[PDB]
Design a protein around this nucleic acid. Structure first.
Ligand SMILES: [Mg+2]
Ligand SMILES: [Mg+2]
Ligand SMILES: [Mg+2]
Ligand SMILES: [Mg+2]
Ligand SMILES: [Mg+2]
Ligand SMILES: [Mg+2]
Ligand SMILES: [Mg+2]
Ligand SMILES: [Mg+2]
Ligand SMILES: [Mg+2]
Lengths: 247, 52, 230
RNA sequence: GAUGGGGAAGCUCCGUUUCAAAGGCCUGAUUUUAUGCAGGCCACCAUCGAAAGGGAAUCCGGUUAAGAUUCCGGAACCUGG
RNA sequence: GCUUAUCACCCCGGAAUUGGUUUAUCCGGAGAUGGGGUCUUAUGGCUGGAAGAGGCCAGCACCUUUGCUGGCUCCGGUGCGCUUGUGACGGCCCGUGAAAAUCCACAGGAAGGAAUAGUUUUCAUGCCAGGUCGUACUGAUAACCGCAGCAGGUCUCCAAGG
RNA sequence: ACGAUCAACUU
RNA sequence: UUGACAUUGUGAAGAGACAGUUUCUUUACUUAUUCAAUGAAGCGGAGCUGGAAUUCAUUUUCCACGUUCUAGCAUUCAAGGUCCCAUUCGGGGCUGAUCCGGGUU
């Protein structure tokens, strides 16, 4: 009989993201004439930590083609990129780690990151630390490229969509156990208000579908259908299966 | 810094009170060497464009 | 001069900030400019039923110029001439009084939509000029059919502003000659012949032809490329 | 949190730079007097939000029933002109 | 006002027999140790401000506005001391720990400028002004909240000897 | 190869 | 969430059943609608300039279009080249920087 926690998150009052210390949105350059027809050279000034982000960020300076000034861009740093390195972004850019190329300008098997879903969206795929997209094929007839995503999914993207050669830096981060509540605390105080988590079965029925009972138990199937409504979707939503894989 | 004279705020050199005199030396050497290399590069290009 | 040298810049990609070029093609115009351009584009993209697009078949430059040369000989009297005409009429009423008509009969261009449509219906109009740019077009869209029904020669001519300046208005949207002088009857007959050769005689064929359906520059090029191979 | 704009029967709601024609710098200046045409200058969008965050510049001695880094005496400093 | 520094940097020189060096093991042919220099002025010293003030005393006069006169006010030491500021470091993070106003410098070269007053002056001195509102007192076993002059509650600075 | 001076508080 | 009608137009194919009608494929078009971006900067077509023509100079042709050791620098309607003017410490046009369509992409 009460609005439950996952319903309350959408009003976004105390559940917004903590963005005070963040360096700015990490995205590729706006796709312009220079990247569309040739290449443009930028310089890596800094590799900086970003609050709430596992991967480090590269800060790259490009010359403005139309006005006398410099433009800062916040890239997600790939493994091996160093300060003082020259970055080449465009159709005619070379196949080197850190360079930004259209997906149609790389051979099959190329490892890229920060891949655009559509050309000009400035990077949407394979952004977290240690993640990458594999180029697996080309269809020049329909100007399309097949890729494998970090989740194992196969995708078809415009060959004009851009990517950064290499793999996102910071990999292996989740291989270290946190060991204690305080490290999770500090991890999430830079992200959002999602920790700690109270179990639904530890609540009363007013608070959660899992609440109540003279023992802690869910009492009805925890696999919830797609067509369930808000306040009902607590548990395993639209689960094709459950239980430990391979016995 | 708006109160004191220019002497307190700069050094008698190019990029006086903005760069550290080793970075200025590095800038000078890099500029001269890359400009000479650009001359060499275009002479090589003009030579190799005469092969045909 | 030994003190001057050839710099030339390299405006290729990655070098030498681009010079100022004409960007008139990429200007983000105000909304009213955008809408008044796109409305014309949409009008010609859609298939135009023959009742419209009977317009945009306007009288050509030479015949229109001579037509207006004739119509300019029958300009309605303005306020300045009407005031002194009324003074002459006042004097004639004072002393002369033939019956009441010491002033001569006027020969003037007839204008005004309701007045002209009534003249067409009574078959008094000997030549009707219809402006080609009346918005809303419903005001004159029936006029060519009405003139054809009544057997009155009509021309679709460019400029409601031009008709207006003919009849001392900002805009007229229609003009008509119902009577001309003897020395201008033969010129009127020549105009009627030329006008009928373009509007009344082709009316039945125009009434069955749909306008519009025209593509833009890029789509036209792409369709030409497709048609070259397929 | 206005404006542009959109929603709402409406009280009003969204949104904070947005799908807007959104402005002020120097220089020519006959200084009865304020301007006349010049040629670009970013495109930053109002405003409110801290007496513990940032921040131009003052100290000592004396003095009252009750005021003082504020008054008196002396000695400084900053900003604008 | 003069002077005064850890760090940093410069010149000479070319280092294995490796050296220098911190409480903490880092540094050196990408030039160490060494010799000689440059710089930030935290901070301290001397001088001006300034002894004329303030402090402590001694002689007379005394409510005659209430005083007057004179002297001294100096030189050292010590530290795992306390409080506090600061520096160079070191540890820690799947945590790497605001923004803007504002000020300055540099790059650039648009203009402007030369002989009994021809430009400009971030150098010295000189002239004028700096509005508005707050400012008393308590801040608590009696000045606040708790029905009160209530053993409750209510943020913070300084902190002597054994 | 020591001598002379100054100074703490730990064991 | 699913269907229907409206928004909602234009070509074809062609399953056809059969002057025509009627459901039914499949794909096509762009201007309605929808998504996104930019300070709406380089879009589309053609041309010039290069190389393979087994070209007929006749593009039944495709690809390229000034930047790739280096943590420098890149701005004053651009120097230059050409014309015009009563030119002084100059002013202007064209070219440099191909042409055309005003569809920002
Ligand atoms: Mg739990
Ligand atoms: Mg319980
Ligand atoms: Mg249930
Ligand atoms: Mg304020
Ligand atoms: Mg007091
Ligand atoms: Mg005073
Ligand atoms: Mg006070
Ligand atoms: Mg007080
Ligand atoms: Mg007080």
């Amino acid at each position: 009989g009460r609005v439950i926690r996952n319903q309350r998150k959408g009003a976004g009052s105390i559940f917004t993201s903590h963005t005070r210390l963040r360096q700015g949105a990490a995205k590729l350059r706006t796709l312009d004439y220079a990247e569309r027809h040739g290449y443009i050279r930028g310089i890596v000034k800094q590799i900086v930590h970003d609050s709430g982000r596992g991967a480090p960020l590269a800060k790259v300076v490009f010359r403005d083609p139309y006005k006398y000034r410099l433009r800062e861009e916040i890239f997600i740093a790939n493994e091996g990129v160093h300060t003082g390195q020259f970055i080449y972004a465009g159709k005619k850019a070379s196949l080197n780690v850190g360079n930004v190329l259209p997906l149609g300008s790389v051979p099959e098997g190329t490892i890229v990151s920060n891949v655009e879903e559509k050309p000009g969206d400035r990077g949407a795929l394979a952004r977290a630390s240690g993640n990458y997209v594999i180029i697996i094929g080309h269809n020049p007839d329909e100007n399309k490229t097949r890729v494998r995503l970090p989740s194992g999914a196969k995708k078809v993207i415009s060959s004009d969509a851009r990517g950064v050669i290499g793999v996102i830096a910071g990999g292996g981060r989740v291989d270290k156990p946190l060991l204690k509540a305080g490290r999770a605390f500090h991890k999430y105080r830079l992200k959002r208000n999602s920790w700690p988590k109270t179990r639904g079965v530890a609540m009363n029925p007013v608070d959660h579908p899992h609440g109540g009972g003279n023992h802690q138990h869910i009492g009805k199937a925890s696999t919830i259908s797609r067509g369930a409504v808000s306040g009902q979707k607590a548990g395993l939503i639209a689960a094709r299966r459950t239980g430990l894989l391979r016995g | 810094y708006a109160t004191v004279s220019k002497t307190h705020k700069t050094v008698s050199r190019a990029y006086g009170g903005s760069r550290c005199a080793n970075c200025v030396k590095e800038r000078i050497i890099r500029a001269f060497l890359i400009e000479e290399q650009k001359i060499v590069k275009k002479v090589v290009k003009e030579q190799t464009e005469a092969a045909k | 001069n030994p003190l001057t040298h050839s710099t030339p810049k390299n405006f290729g990609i990655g070098q030498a900030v681009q010079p100022k070029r004409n960007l008139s093609r990429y200007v983000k115009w105000p909304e009213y400019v955008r809408v008044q351009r796109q409305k014309k584009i949409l009008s010609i993209r859609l298939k135009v039923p023959p009742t419209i697009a009977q317009f945009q078949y306007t009288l050509d430059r030479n015949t229109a110029a001579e037509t207006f040369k004739l119509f300019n000989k029958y300009r309605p009297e303005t306020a300045a001439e009407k005031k002194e005409r009324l003074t002459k009429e006042a004097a004639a009423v004072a002393e002369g009084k033939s019956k009441q008509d010491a002033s001569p009969k006027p020969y003037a261009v007839k204008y005004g939509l309701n007045h002209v449509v009534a003249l067409i219906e009574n078959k008094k109009a000997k030549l009707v000029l219809i402006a080609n740019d009346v918005d809303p077009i419903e005001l004159v869209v029936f006029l060519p059919a009405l003139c054809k029904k009544m057997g009155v020669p009509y021309a679709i001519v460019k400029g409601k502003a031009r008709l207006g300046t003919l009849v001392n208005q900002k805009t007229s949207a229609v003009a008509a000659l119902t009577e001309v002088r003897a020395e201008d009857e033969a010129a009127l007959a020549k105009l009627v012949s030329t006008i009928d050769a373009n509007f009344a005689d082709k009316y039945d064929e125009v009434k069955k032809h749909w306008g519009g359906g025209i593509l833009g520059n890029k789509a036209q090029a792409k369709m030409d490329k497709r048609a070259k191979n397929s």
